[PDB]
Design a protein around this ligand. Structure first.
Ligand SMILES: Cc1cc2nc3c(=O)[nH]c(=O)nc-3n(C[C@H](O)[C@H](O)[C@H](O)COP(=O)(O)OP(=O)(O)OC[C@H]3O[C@@H](n4cnc5c(N)ncnc54)[C@H](O)[C@@H]3O)c2cc1C
Ligand SMILES: Cc1cc2nc3c(=O)[nH]c(=O)nc-3n(C[C@H](O)[C@H](O)[C@H](O)COP(=O)(O)OP(=O)(O)OC[C@H]3O[C@@H](n4cnc5c(N)ncnc54)[C@H](O)[C@@H]3O)c2cc1C
Ligand code: NI
Ligand code: NI
Lengths: 447, 446
């Protein structure tokens, strides 16, 4: 309460740094509290999207593990520095190097590295933007096992593992599996559930599994992990299936909201999944405090955090019309090799909801651009509503899908019927022009 | 004509093979006449888009000249064979291995390899789909010069040139320049006019020229090429600026409609640039004869020939609403490295056409995904109409632009204002999400 600001952002995350710079541009004095200098710019810059896809990219080029990890460090360092200065060099923004914890509903304590309160600050509005952290499972032996990593640890590993065992079969785990396979590591993936990528289209998943296994990746389902044991050299994952000996183990079973904020000092309520409860305007249960990004639950994407900035900007400075209920369709990409990109419904979901739908598909081996790419792998699939010819969903598994899926997102939001994408002129030779064939079909009516 | 078909297609081009397969699917008996088995599937498959970009793609990966040319041969052979059988195996299509020339308005002579007439055929509708060919300049010494190629010859060359001299500086010429530089050849480009890519945005072109020159490519403007002379091993390109010693010369100064069809036997008229004259439905001056693709003039793109199939299909089988006047916005890509993609107007054109416009730009080095790509080169630039916030044009020079430009094409056609692209959720980390910044700007009224 000692030092007053117009706005406080807790965490140097995506929504937070974007909102802080906007507020400063209006003349408001902003405090951005960030607990680690290694996290300037947030998770995407330092321990997530950017380093991981740098390694994905360079591995597809056949670059070595060493060369790829070295260039990843240069990329992260450069973008960390440039993100830091974008905020800190602004006269209306103070980047405060402390761990934040609430003193009350109106006052935020600033803690040094020894967990001591050094100062306190206040502002009429407070934005919680503290992200998520890797879930640590309760597994016998984990607390003293060597050679065990979360995603952050693995992105900073000091050696190439000859054999990586991944505990977890979700999208991030599978990204790391393809990433390390393409860098020359043997990879084993252990999924507790009955299948990989449930909720994705099962025709597409079958090709994706084939393509993973053709890289020499071993995939296991129904795996119950009971214990970790380790040497100076190896770590064994003991399971109901088998004992898997590894040179490194990745724990990738989920990410939980980071709410270590002394919330007991506030009226801020948490939900059933540990997330900060927010309304459609991202207001917490304390009206002048908002929460943005992974910490408020739901989807964990950098662009959802960016959209949260749009919502909070709309609430605080705009016409309040933007909410979590009018984001538009949310696309995403699973960065296996090639990438699996998705927006909207699968044909299974369209049928379950009793849509009168038509599905159509196109193997990437039937797309002439695949010859130029020297890559025949993949499957493109679309689902359309016969009642109005609008697109209900698409799954693009294949090269360039992380770019192309944005065309289909735009079409869904703007009610562009599938016949327009069928008949359009596209550049050539490209992956985009495959839409002339992907959308070349007539109704198959379902009663 | 001795034998009668429901439809005759002259040339195994893009519009033609697409229309043949559609017509056959309605039960019609189709003849497709093609003069060369090296051209099943047309120019794109055999001597144009597909082989050139195969070499572009593999050269960006650092593959050797020999490895890239060998795989190019594999790609062309596979797709040529696939295209041939897609038509020939069809019960309702005959692929006829002859050179076509008109006998009259209603029947087509079939010529053997010695230009002798073998037979003739007729059909109530005839589609001319014969494409274009490289323009041959009048340069002293060309008749007897060794080591000189057009685009087809260069794509089938049997050795790696140590020094390729390109006579011509248009888009296809520049694609070959970057293609051979990336395979390790030295390249010199000779442009007769005062600048390269004069129709493109000049800020972008300046970056494009720097990036070509950083590859070691020499670029010359105001070049008059006066003579070619040759050794058993080298060819001298004689020029007003200097003589250039090379071991291969590419002549790339344009492509003219291929109308070698004995049109004097018909009422089909040609326009002032040698093109077959067509109306908006692609009808020639003989109403039952249509022309599609490069041969009827205008833009030479594979996707224009594909859209010509759509127009002729609408004319002969549909509601005839489809014309050359409602194609929508036509994007294109100059496949230098990185690709320069464009749709709609430049700033210069917008100012000339009296718009109240705003331009905005974004360097690729300001796009965080460029770090993942390991490539900081490029410039994205957009032009919007301040009257209605619609997009007038865009120039995307940088990686993935040949895919991204299609997003902007769709927005222009569907009247999606630039603010929707500014505010949209994009996947991450991608080149597409740069649109959040590229379109983040306000009016500057003119
Ligand atoms: C391996 C991996 C790969 C991913 N790949 C993708 C991808 O391809 N695409 C995609 O869209 N998303 C991807 N994500 C997810 C994406 O990175 C996150 O969803 C997004 O970055 C979350 O941003 P945020 O704004 O919620 O906060 P964050 O960017 O996580 O920032 C929160 C900040 O708050 C700080 N902080 C926390 N508590 C305190 C405190 N008490 N005091 C002070 N500071 C504090 C943290 O140090 C951190 O810097 C990936 C994630 C991981 C782990
Ligand atoms: C090097 C190069 C690169 C290119 N790159 C691109 C690119 O990236 N993107 C793009 O969109 N476009 C590109 N193009 C242009 C594109 O290839 C053409 O615009 C398009 O392929 C022309 O198609 P078409 O339908 O007009 O006929 P074509 O595909 O040219 O087919 C005409 C056919 O008619 C046959 N024929 C001619 N006369 C007769 C006759 N008398 N009897 C029988 N058969 C006959 C020919 O043998 C040929 O098979 C490129 C062109 C070149 C040369
Ligand atoms: Ni119907
Ligand atoms: Ni204005």
């Amino acid at each position: 309460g000692m030092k007053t600001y117009d706005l406080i952002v807790i965490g140097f995350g995506k929504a937070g740094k974007t909102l802080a710079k906007y507020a400063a541009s209006t003349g408001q004095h902003v405090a951005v509290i960030e607990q680690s200098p290694k996290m300037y710019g947030g998770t995407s810059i330092n321990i997530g999207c950017i380093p991981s896809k740098t390694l994905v990219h360079d591995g597809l080029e056949g670059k070595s593990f060493e060369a790829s990890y070295n260039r990843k460090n240069d990329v992260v360092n450069a973008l960390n520095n440039k993100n830091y200065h974008l905020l800190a060099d602004d006269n209306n923004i103070d980047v405060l190097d402390f761990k934040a914890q609430f003193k009350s509903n109106t006052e935020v304590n600033l803690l040094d590295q020894h967990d001591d309160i050094v100062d306190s600050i206040t502002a009429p509005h407070i934005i919680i933007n503290t992200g998520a952290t890797s879930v640590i499972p309760n597994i016998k032996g984990l607390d003293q096992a060597k050679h065990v990593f979360d995603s952050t640890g693995l992105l900073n590993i000091s050696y190439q593992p000859k054999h990586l065992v991944i505990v977890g079969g979700g999208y991030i785990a599978l990204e790391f599996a393809s990433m390390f396979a393409n860098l020359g590591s043997k990879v084993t993936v252990l999924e507790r559930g009955e299948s990989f990528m449930p909720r994705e289209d099962q025709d597409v998943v079958a090709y994706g599994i084939t393509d993973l296994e053709n890289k020499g990746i071993a995939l296991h389902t129904n795996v119950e992990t009971t214990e970790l044991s380790s040497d100076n050299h190896h770590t064994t994952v003991h399971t109901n299936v088998d004992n898997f000996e590894a040179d490194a183990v990745l724990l990738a079973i989920g990410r939980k909201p980071n709410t270590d904020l002394a919330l007991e000092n506030t009226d801020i309520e948490l939900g059933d999944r540990g997330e900060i409860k927010v309304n459609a305007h991202l207001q917490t249960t304390v009206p002048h405090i908002y929460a943005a990004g992974d910490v408020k639950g739901g989807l964990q994407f950098t662009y959802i955090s960016l959209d949260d900035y749009r919502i909070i900007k709309s609430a605080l400075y705009g016409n309040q019309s933007r909410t979590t209920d009018n984001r538009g369709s949310v696309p995403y990409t699973v960065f296996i090799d090639p990438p699996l990109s998705r927006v909207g419904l699968t044909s299974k979901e369209a049928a379950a909801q009793h849509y009168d739908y038509t599905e159509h598909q196109l193997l990437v081996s039937a797309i002439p651009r695949h010859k130029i790419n020297n890559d025949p792998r993949g499957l493109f699939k679309v689902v359309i509503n016969n009642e109005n010819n609008m697109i209900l969903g698409a799954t693009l598994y294949g090269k360039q899908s992380e770019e192309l899926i944005n065309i289909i997102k735009l079409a869904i939001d703007q009610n562009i019927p599938y016949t327009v994408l069928r008949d359009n002129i596209y550049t050539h030779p490209t992956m985009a022009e495959s839409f002339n064939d992907l959308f070349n079909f007539h109704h198959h009516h379902h009663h």
